Design a protein around this ligand. Structure first.
Ligand SMILES: Cc1cc2nc3c(=O)[nH]c(=O)nc-3n(C[C@H](O)[C@H](O)[C@H](O)COP(=O)(O)O)c2cc1C
Ligand code: SF4
Ligand code: SF4
Ligand code: SF4
Ligand code: FES
Ligand SMILES: [Zn+2]
Lengths: 209, 181, 240, 117
């Protein structure tokens, strides 16, 4: 009822039907990510868990690729090493210059993640510039600067499915996508503040602290 | 002789006047000597707080580095391409003797070659046993040199020495220090 | 299923299916509706055969080109998600899936969009970029970041506020987007740039060299030596 | 002026120095520690000493509030605070401001408030 495969030479066995990223965690090969989570539903929005798969035309996300037997998983293909720098660079062209005012200074998952796999430069030097996002008042508990958000969906899937306050949501296409009620109404579920440990950037953070 | 004595009008020093210069030429050990004061309207003008060259100054960079389109980082990476600390047991050198080398292997039968590997990889033989086992050509090929000589303690870039001795030397004879290079 | 490929299905059950397979290539078989437009004499739509020459298509069944076969500069087979065929290939190319993939391109919906030589290809592709910016959903971080990146690149290229390196910078960004999207919209976003890159590289340079002595010289990223950030907005730069 | 020195004894400093600032008398932080707390803490090393020649450093919350709120024609503003005389890179880094909500919006470094019009 279990499946053994190969990640970077490391043979590893895991229960069938599971996600590939858990197999990478079990094998000990660390794979970076932004929108996978254990206790949450799986969406491939982050594009970070790209990984090379034998019998695959293109590198695929390791979060939602299901475990199949006879699998050869490679993480250090030069195409994949290209791809991670690529996706990091794509993410870092609308995230604003807030690293000394953002709350998660050392705890920015994105940031430590962008030191291993980030580019040297960033060729944003466009004139008319990045997008920018409304303040988005929510409540007296959760500090909110939605400019730093990357729409990693990890807030809204949680408050949807497990916290059970479905007031959060994604509204708009492209860079007109926002997160939250566009009523500007107060969020409350009885575990409300659990999203600020969960948004991996400091878009949602702690208001008294 | 390309760095010998030059006269004192090319030394950037406060100098003298002209009857006192005519005095001190007759009264000095060598005339070509600077009094040590730099020339005031030349040395440290304009001040480093006001330099017109400092107004336009963007960045020093090189062409394969600053090339935005062509390179990725991982081709020009240098921290993650470090060499590994090659460690060698006593046992793996016995592996290098009898099992051979990737230059010249001594092992066929790749199935049982693993078995011949693995007891030595578990400690089937000893090193001195392998030394008695190693042939004269084995010892003179992969332990000693082809003449059977011990290897010289090897150096990065051997620097042969000249000894400059004559008028290009920095001291004439009598002075005990020589100036080899 | 496409409404067309399911509306052909009852007739092909009524007729012979191998009779339908008696057309075009072995594989690329039968007919397709061709919505043909752009700068033609006769904007029309014909139900005609696969694997056919473009010249016999346009010259015989859509009148001609306003200014003749001279006045074409390029052609877009299919929808917008297809790189532009240049002049030398489009004369002798079949309308199948094979030959367009052989010239690294798509047959698409087999809309034909011909381009006036006396008009601007850079406007024609910049509008496709903003077409995608209005119509990206936002699951992929690459696609959503990508098209708003591409758009400002194309505006800066249209006025000509770039340097010569930045067009291949855009080419690497195209293949950055290309294979890394959930749906194939990033594949759609990639190719209209690569048509411009592979087939109009001195053509962009002519516009850019023109802009270089319209006004003062430009640095990277569109910034000029006077393009500065005063009270509120920017000044100096003329805002692509 | 006269504040209790933990014993019923009052200490008496002029009202020019019961001040957070020459620009502001009131505190501006939750743990600001007003001067009325500070002389209450250690006047021990303040006796026999001048009251004038301490800093009084012209606090910023009054100075930022009287800067004119700028207007932006489009949607997204940009703030640098950099001079256009200084040959270098000064000011705060190039962050952008969305101004859509009713009311001005301070750039979180420079404190200049911008308004969409
Ligand atoms: C962004 C995107 C947009 C698409 N829009 C259409 C459309 O508007 N009409 C259509 O028939 N197919 C469209 N397609 C292709 C559909 O996916 C197509 O129906 C399907 O892939 C194949 O269906 P078929 O077997 O009928 O050809 C689109 C594909 C993508 C990736
Ligand atoms: S979340 Fe972004 S802006 Fe904030 S500290 Fe991390 S990298 Fe900097
Ligand atoms: S609200 Fe925060 S956690 Fe949720 S998707 Fe946006 S940045 Fe991520
Ligand atoms: S390629 Fe498709 S799924 Fe991905 S972000 Fe764009 S529209 Fe969304
Ligand atoms: S979690 Fe794997 S792609 Fe987002
Ligand atoms: Zn500011």
């Amino acid at each position: 009822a279990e499946i053994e495969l190969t990640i970077d030479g490391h043979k590893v066995s895991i229960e069938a039907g599971s996600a590939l990223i858990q197999a990478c965690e079990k094998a000990g090969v660390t794979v970076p990510r932004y929108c996978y989570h254990d206790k949450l539903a799986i969406a491939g929005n982050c594009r970070m868990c790209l990984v090379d798969v034998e019998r695959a035309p293109k590198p695929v996300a390791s979060c939602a690729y299901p475990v199949a037997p006879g699998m050869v998983v490679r993480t250090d293909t030069e195409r994949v090493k290209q791809a991670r720098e690529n996706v990091m660079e794509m993410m870092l062209q609308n995230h604003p210059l807030d690293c000394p005012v953002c709350d998660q200074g050392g705890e920015c998952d994105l940031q430590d993640q962008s030191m291993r796999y980030g580019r040297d430069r960033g060729r944003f030097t466009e004139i008319t510039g990045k997008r920018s996002t409304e303040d988005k008042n929510i409540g007296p508990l959760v500090k909110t600067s939605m400019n730093r958000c990357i729409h990693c969906t990890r807030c809204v899937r949680f408050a949807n499915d497990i916290a059970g306050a479905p007031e959060l949501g994604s509204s708009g296409r492209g860079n007109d996508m926002q997160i939250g009620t566009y009523l500007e109404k107060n969020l409350n579920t009885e575990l409300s503040g659990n999203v600020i440990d969960l948004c991996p950037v400091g878009a949602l953070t702690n208001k008294p602290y | 002789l390309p760095g010998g004595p030059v006269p004192v009008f090319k030394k950037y020093t406060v100098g003298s006047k002209g009857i006192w210069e005519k005095l001190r030429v007759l009264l000095a050990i060598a005339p070509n000597r600077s009094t040590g004061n730099p020339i005031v309207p030349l040395y440290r003008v304009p001040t480093p707080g006001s330099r017109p060259e400092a107004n336009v100054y963007q960045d020093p960079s090189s062409y394969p580095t600053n090339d935005i389109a062509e390179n990725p980082y991982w081709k020009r990476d240098h921290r993650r391409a470090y060499p590994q600390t090659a460690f060698f047991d006593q046992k793996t050198v016995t592996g290098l003797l009898e099992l051979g080398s990737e230059a010249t292997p001594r092992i066929a039968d790749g199935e049982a070659g693993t078995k011949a590997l693995a007891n030595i990889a578990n400690g089937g033989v000893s090193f001195t046993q392998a030394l008695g086992k190693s042939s004269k050509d084995v010892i003179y090929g992969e332990v000693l040199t082809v003449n059977g000589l011990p290897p010289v303690a090897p150096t990065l870039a051997p620097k042969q020495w000249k000894i400059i001795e004559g008028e290009a030397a920095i001291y004439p004879k009598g002075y005990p220090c020589r100036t080899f290079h | 299923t496409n409404v067309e490929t399911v509306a052909v299905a009852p007739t092909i059950l009524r007729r012979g299916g191998d009779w339908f397979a008696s057309f075009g290539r072995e594989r690329n078989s039968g007919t397709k509706l061709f919505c043909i437009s752009g700068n033609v004499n006769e904007p029309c739509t014909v139900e005609e055969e696969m694997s056919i020459p473009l010249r016999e298509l346009l010259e015989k069944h859509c009148g001609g080109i306003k200014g003749g076969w001279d006045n074409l500069l390029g052609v877009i087979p299919g929808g917008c998600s297809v790189p532009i065929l240049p002049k030398n290939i489009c004369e002798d190319v079949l309308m199948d899936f094979d030959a367009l993939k052989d010239v690294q391109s798509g047959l698409g919906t087999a809309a034909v969009i011909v381009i006036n030589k006396q008009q601007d290809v850079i406007r024609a592709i910049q509008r496709f970029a903003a077409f995608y910016k209005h119509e990206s959903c936002g699951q992929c971080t690459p696609c959503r970041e990508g098209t708003t990146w591409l758009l400002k690149a194309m505006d800066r290229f249209r006025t000509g506020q770039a340097k010569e390196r930045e067009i291949d910078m855009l080419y690497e960004l195209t293949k950055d987007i290309e294979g890394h999207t959930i749906c194939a919209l990033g594949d759609a976003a990639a190719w209209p740039i690569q048509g411009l890159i592979r087939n109009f590289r001195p053509e962009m340079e002519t516009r850019m060299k023109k802009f270089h002595d319209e006004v003062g010289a430009v640095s990277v990223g569109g910034w000029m030596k006077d393009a500065r950030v005063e009270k509120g907005k920017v000044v100096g730069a003329p805002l692509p | 002026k006269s504040i209790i020195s933990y014993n019923g004894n009052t200490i008496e400093i002029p009202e020019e120095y019961t001040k957070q600032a020459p620009n502001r008398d009131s505190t501006w932080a939750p743990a600001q520690a007003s001067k009325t707390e500070i002389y209450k803490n250690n006047m021990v090393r303040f006796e026999q000493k001048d009251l004038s020649k301490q800093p009084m450093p012209y606090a910023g919350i009054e100075l930022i509030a009287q800067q004119p709120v700028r207007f932006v024609h489009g949607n997204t503003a940009v703030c640098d605070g950099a001079n256009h005389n200084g040959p270098g890179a000064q000011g705060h880094p190039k962050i952008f401001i969305n101004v859509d909500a009713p009311g001005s919006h301070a750039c979180q470094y420079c404190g200049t408030r911008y308004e969409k019009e």
